[PDB]
A paper describes a structure:
Nicotinamide mononucleotide adenylyltransferase (NMNAT) was initially identified as an NAD+ synthase that catalyzes the reversible conversion of NMN (nicotinamide mononucleotide) to NAD+ in the final step of both the de novo biosynthesis and salvage pathways in most organisms across all three kingdoms of life. Intriguingly, in addition to the well-studied NAD+ synthase activity, NMNAT has been found to be able to retrieve the activity of luciferase from heat-denatured amorphous aggregation suggesting a chaperone-like activity of NMNAT. By combining multiple biophysical and computational approaches, we reveal the molecular mechanism of NMNAT as a specific chaperone of pTau. Taken together, these results indicate that NMNAT adopts a conserved pocket to bind both the enzymatic substrates and pTau.
Author numbering:
A (entry chain B): 4 to 111, 125 to 234
B (entry chain A): 4 to 110, 125 to 234
The structure:
Amino acid sequence: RIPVVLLACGSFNPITNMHLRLFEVARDHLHQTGRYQVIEGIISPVNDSYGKKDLVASHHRVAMARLALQTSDWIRVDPWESEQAQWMETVKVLRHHHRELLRSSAQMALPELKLLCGADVLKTFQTPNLWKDTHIQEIVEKFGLVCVSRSGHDPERYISDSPILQQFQHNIHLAREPVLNEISATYVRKALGQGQSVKYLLPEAVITYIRDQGLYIN
Amino acid sequence: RIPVVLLACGSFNPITNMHLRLFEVARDHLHQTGRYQVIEGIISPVNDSYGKKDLVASHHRVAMARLALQTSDWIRVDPWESEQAQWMETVKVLRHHHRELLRSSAQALPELKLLCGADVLKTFQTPNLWKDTHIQEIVEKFGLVCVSRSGHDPERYISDSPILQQFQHNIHLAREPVLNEISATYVRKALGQGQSVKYLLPEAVITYIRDQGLYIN
């Protein structure tokens, strides 16, 4: 009933089959509750400001995400966060896309914008950078979390061990289906650096881009 | 070094990104040992005589495997096993393909090894098989490349069978995690429920399944 947009923040360094699968599982879960209609997915790669030494330039990560999504009919990459001239907090990215969602919807209930993350975020509060204490309440309260759990994640204990999460747990949606694609970008970077295969862990066009551009080779 | 062919037998009902990942991990492992040169991979779907209720017709399973292998330059699907009049034990499939390997001459003696996950390795060591002569022929004459599936202990499987223990030196344990922990059983259940299996299978396989109306209740 409620139209919803799923925003995924993170380094996407590189994007993998895990990140794409997260969108699919989350959309199925929200549709399965009966109360939501998922309209769009947004992949928002992190800004280069103060980035880790292993973080490749943002125009590469945007290009790889675009190649990864050419078989998707509902997820798009938005480079706005990465184009900003400063360090960006996730809550400000959500505010920006929420505003542009309210604008676009007026031209065509009112839509909602939710942050898509793994269950580990409920313990870590990093997407990919540690959120400020004063921003956690706004993210879980005004937007909400759609959490997909990898093996070994325990979202209900994470929510128990956090008073702010418990306070507003009604805006945290725990998807039930497993991720199965247990593929961190860290593993892919290590494998690439050691010359090991990453075929079938990320789309072939991303692998081709990585080789052509010489990324992730030490 | 010695040329090696990897053979995977199974239902492939449907093939998933897990099966293809297994081949890549196995080839990297063998190459890393320094003693082997992997020249080919063979996917061999099971005969329909086998025949559980949810086993789709072998024509479709080898069609889907062929579509999945379009982007591979070294793994092929061989429908020989599925075209025989009767189901065959794995060891007879190994015998057949080993003969084919020898006949395509030799660049030593090429070797043919069976590729499996640790869950199949588990099926080789239950106590009814501790004296089985086919299991022994598999590990003595061909050998095994085992890719570890999270939550399995291949070393204890090896130690619990006297046959596997005796021929442990022809059982190769790949170290890299599979990561694509995707069962065909999950995929069928999700397809029957209308759930997404995108990014769990090659896109052309999902398209074939949709176009053919497979796995729908």
